[PDB]
C-alpha cells in the first residue's frame, strides 16, 4: 500500500506539472479582446406557483416550453411555462425528491432522491394519467441527479459515490461509473450524450465516457463539495459550482480549471449552475437566495436574478435559449428573460 | 383557443388536486430521525430503500418520520433535505472510541448548520438504563472521556428518576448539560433544543416528541408575530 501511495503521489505531481505546462495563463488573460456583456437586466416573466415545499430540482423540455419541476413535498409537476398551466401533477412514492429529468423525446420524466430509486414516469399514457412506468433500483446512496440519454437509456448520479447508466426497459444497470470518493451531487450529459461530467463532494469533477464506463479525466481545483455541474454548450468544456462560494469552468481537453468566478462578498455555496444557450452567460444559483449571471469569459458578474425568497436549488436554460427557469427553497419557480 | 381551453381544464383539475393535497401536506409534520446505529434509533423506529418513512399520529395529528437508513455516514448533503422538517429527533449512543463525543460533534454540526439553524432538534438520550448499568458497574468510565465530569455536580433543577442512583442522575444531567452547552451557544432563539431522558422501549417517546412538536409550532407562530 505504501508503494501504491508513492506511485499515486508521483502521478499526481506529474499531472500537476502537465497541467501547469499547458496553462501559463487563465481565461481572462486570453479574452481581453472579447466585448464585455455589461449589466444583464434580466427580469422575471412568469412565476410558477403550486409547489408546497422547496423545489429541489427542475428540468426543461426539449421543446423549451414544458418543464418538469420536483418539490420535496413529493410532487413532480410539469408546467407549460408559456401559459403557466400545469400539464401534469405526479405524486411521488418518496417525498424526498432531490432530482428530476425530462426525457428529450418528452414522453417520460424521471425523479429520485433519498429513496435511492430512479422512478421513470410515462407521460403519454393510454390510461390518461401518469403511472409509475419503471423503477431503477440499485443505488445504495441518495440519488442526487438523473439525466435521460433517450427514451430507454438514462444516466444517474448517487450519494453512494457512484454513477449508474441504466437501460430503462430491462431495469438493469448497463454501466457503473466509480472513482468518486465524495457524494456525487450532480451530472451533466454532453451534447452528443457520449460523455458526462459528474461533480462530487470530494471537490473533484470526473468526466466519464458513457459507452465503456471509465473515468476519462478528474478535474480538480475546487476547495469544497461540488453541488452543481453543467457542460458548456460546445461540449468541450463544463462548469461547476461548489460550497467554496466559487464557480469554476474546466476544459475537458486541457484537464484543468479554465476560469474561476468568485467575489469576496460571496461566501455562500453555488447550489446550481447552467450556461446560456451560447455559453456566454453562466447562471449560478447561490445559497444567499440570489442567482448570479456571470459573464463566463470576463468572469465578472454580469447580473443578479434576485427575487427568490429562499435558497436557489436549481436552474435550467431552455434549449432554444429563450428563458431561464430558477427554482428555489421558497417553493417557487421563476422564469426569466 | 380550443387547445388553450382544454389545457386550462386540465390545469384546473390539477390545481384542485394540488389544493386537496396541500391540506394533507400541511396537516402532516415531517420529522427527521438521526443518530448512530448503536443509539437504539431502530428500536424507537420499531416502537413507533435509502429512507424509511414512518407515518404515525398523535391525537389525530399526522407525523411523517424519515429514518435515514441505507445512506452513507457523510450526512452533510442529504441532511440539507431536512431543513423544513418540524424537528430532528437526534438519538444519541451514550452507553467509535468515544461515541458520545461523536454524537456531541454531530449535534453541534446540526445546530450550527446554516440550513438547520431554523430547524428545531429534539434530543433523545436513549441508553438511560444501560448508562445506569454501566455507571453503577464502573464500566462506562465516562469520567475519563470527560474530565469535567469529575467536577460536575447534579444541578438544582434536576429531578431524579424514582429509584435512580445519584451517580446515574449526575451522569445523565452531565450529558444533557453538554448538549445544552452546545445548543445554547449561538442558539439565538431561531431554533430550539429539547433534550430528554428516555429508554428504548419507552412509550412516552411519541408524546415527548409530539408535545415538543406542538411547542415548536407554537414558538414558530410567535416568531411570526415578533413575540419572541
Amino acid at each position: 500500500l505504501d508503494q501504491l501511495r508513492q506511485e499515486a503521489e508521483q502521478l499526481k505531481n506529474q499531472i500537476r506539472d502537465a497541467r501547469k505546462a499547458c496553462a501559463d495563463a487563465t481565461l481572462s488573460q486570453i479574452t481581453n479582446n472579447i466585448d464585455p456583456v455589461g449589466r444583464i437586466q434580466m427580469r422575471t416573466r412568469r412565476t410558477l406557483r403550486g409547489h408546497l415545499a422547496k423545489i429541489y430540482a427542475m428540468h426543461w423540455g426539449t421543446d423549451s416550453r414544458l418543464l418538469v419541476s420536483a418539490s420535496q413535498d413529493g410532487k413532480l409537476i410539469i408546467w407549460d411555462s408559456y401559459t403557466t398551466n400545469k400539464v401534469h401533477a405526479i405524486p411521488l412514492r418518496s417525498s424526498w425528491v432531490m432530482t428530476c429529468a425530462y426525457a428529450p423525446s418528452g414522453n417520460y420524466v424521471a425523479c429520485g432522491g433519498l429513496d435511492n430509486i430512479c422512478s421513470i414516469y410515462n407521460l403519454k399514457t393510454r390510461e390518461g394519467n401518469v403511472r409509475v412506468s419503471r423503477e431503477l433500483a440499485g443505488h445504495t446512496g441518495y440519488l442526487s441527479c438523473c439525466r435521460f440519454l433517450d427514451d430507454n437509456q438514462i444516466v444517474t448520479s448517487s450519494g453512494d459515490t457512484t454513477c449508474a447508466l441504466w437501460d430503462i426497459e430491462t431495469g438493469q444497470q448497463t454501466t457503473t461509473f466509480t472513482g468518486h470518493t465524495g457524494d456525487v451531487m450532480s451530472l451533466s450529459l454532453a451534447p452528443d450524450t457520449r460523455l458526462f461530467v459528474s461533480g462530487a463532494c470530494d471537490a473533484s469533477a470526473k468526466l466519464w465516457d458513457v459507452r465503456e464506463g471509465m473515468c476519462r479525466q478528474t478535474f480538480t481545483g475546487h476547495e469544497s463539495d461540488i453541488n452543481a455541474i453543467c457542460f458548456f454548450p460546445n461540449g468541450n468544456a463544463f462548469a461547476t459550482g461548489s460550497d467554496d462560494a466559487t464557480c469554476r469552468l474546466f476544459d475537458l481537453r486541457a484537464d484543468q480549471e479554465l476560469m474561476t468566478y468568485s467575489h469576496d462578498n460571496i461566501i455562500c455555496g453555488i447550489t446550481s449552475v447552467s450556461f446560456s444557450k451560447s455559453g456566454r452567460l453562466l447562471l449560478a444559483g447561490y445559497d444567499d437566495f440570489n442567482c448570479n449571471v456571470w459573464d463566463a469569459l470576463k468572469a465578472d458578474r454580469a447580473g443578479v436574478l434576485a427575487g427568490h425568497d429562499n435558497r436557489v436549488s436549481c436552474l435550467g436554460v431552455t434549449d432554444d435559449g429563450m428563458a431561464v427557469a430558477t427554482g428555489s427553497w421558497d417553493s417557487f419557480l421563476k422564469i426569466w428573460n | 383557443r380550443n387547445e388553450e381551453k382544454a389545457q386550462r381544464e386540465a390545469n384546473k383539475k390539477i390545481e384542485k388536486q394540488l389544493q386537496k393535497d396541500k391540506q394533507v401536506y400541511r396537516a402532516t409534520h415531517r420529522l427527521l430521525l438521526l443518530g448512530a446505529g448503536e443509539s437504539g434509533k431502530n428500536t424507537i423506529v420499531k416502537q413507533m430503500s435509502g429512507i424509511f418513512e414512518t407515518k404515525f399520529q398523535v391525537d389525530k395529528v399526522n407525523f411523517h418520520m424519515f429514518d435515514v437508513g441505507a445512506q452513507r455516514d457523510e450526512r452533510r448533503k442529504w441532511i440539507q433535505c431536512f431543513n423544513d422538517v418540524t424537528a430532528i429527533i437526534f438519538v444519541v449512543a451514550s452507553s467509535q472510541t468515544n461515541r458520545l463525543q461523536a454524537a456531541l460533534k454531530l449535534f453541534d454540526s446540526i445546530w450550527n448548520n446554516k440550513w438547520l439553524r431554523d430547524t428545531s432538534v429534539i434530543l433523545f438520550l436513549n441508553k438511560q438504563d444501560l448508562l445506569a448499568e454501566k455507571v453503577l458497574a464502573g464500566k462506562s468510565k465516562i469520567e475519563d472521556y470527560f474530565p469535567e465530569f469529575a467536577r460536575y455536580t447534579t444541578p438544582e433543577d434536576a429531578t431524579p428518576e424514582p429509584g435512580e442512583d445519584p451517580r446515574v442522575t449526575r451522569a445523565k444531567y452531565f450529558i444533557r448539560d453538554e448538549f445544552l452547552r452546545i445548543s445554547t451557544a449561538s442558539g439565538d432563539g431561531r431554533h430550539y433544543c429539547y433534550p430528554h431522558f428516555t429508554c428504548a422501549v419507552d412509550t412516552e417517546n411519541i408524546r415527548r416528541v409530539f408535545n415538543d412538536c406542538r411547542d415548536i409550532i407554537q414558538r414558530m407562530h410567535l416568531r411570526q408575530y415578533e413575540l419572541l
Epitope: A203, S224, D243, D244 | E74, R75, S109, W111
Partner: nanobody
C-alpha cells in the same frame, strides 16, 4: 486538489511529548475550521480536537483536555497538535481533517469512514 499531510508522528515513550504537524494545500487554510481525529487500532475514527478559522475558538475531546494543545498557523497554512502526557491508549493514526465548507461553524462528517478532506494520517505509537 485538497491535500492534508500529517508529519511528526512516531514512537514516543508513555508520558512523553510529541508534535503533530499538518501541512495543508489546495485551499485557503484560514477560511476553514480544522480538526484532529484519530483512528485507534480496532476502533472507529474518534474525534480529538478542533480549532476555528482564526484560532480564537478551540475545543478538545475529553481524553485530551489539558494534555494536548491544538493550534493553527494561518501564515504557514498549517495545523499543530502539541501532545503531552501521552498514555498508551493514545497510540493511533492521527488524521488532520478539514471541515467541508468554509466560513461555516458546522464541521459535518470529519469522522466518517471515507471523508474526502482528510489527511492520510500519521502513526503515533506510545
Amino acid at each position: 486538489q485538497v491535500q492534508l499531510q500529517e508529519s511528526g508522528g512516531g514512537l514516543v515513550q508513555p508520558g512523553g511529548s510529541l508534535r503533530l504537524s499538518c501541512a495543508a494545500s489546495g485551499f485557503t487554510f484560514s477560511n476553514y475550521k480544522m480538526n484532529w481525529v484519530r483512528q485507534a487500532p480496532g476502533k472507529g475514527l474518534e474525534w480529538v480536537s478542533d480549532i476555528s478559522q482564526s484560532g480564537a475558538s478551540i475545543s478538545y475531546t475529553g481524553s485530551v483536555k489539558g494534555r494536548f494543545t491544538i493550534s493553527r498557523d494561518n501564515a504557514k497554512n498549517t495545523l499543530y497538535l502539541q501532545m503531552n502526557s501521552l498514555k498508551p491508549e493514545d497510540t493511533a493514526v492521527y488524521y488532520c481533517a478539514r471541515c467541508p465548507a468554509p466560513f461555516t461553524r458546522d464541521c459535518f462528517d470529519v469522522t466518517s469512514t471515507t471523508y474526502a478532506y482528510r489527511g492520510q494520517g500519521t502513526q503515533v505509537t506510545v
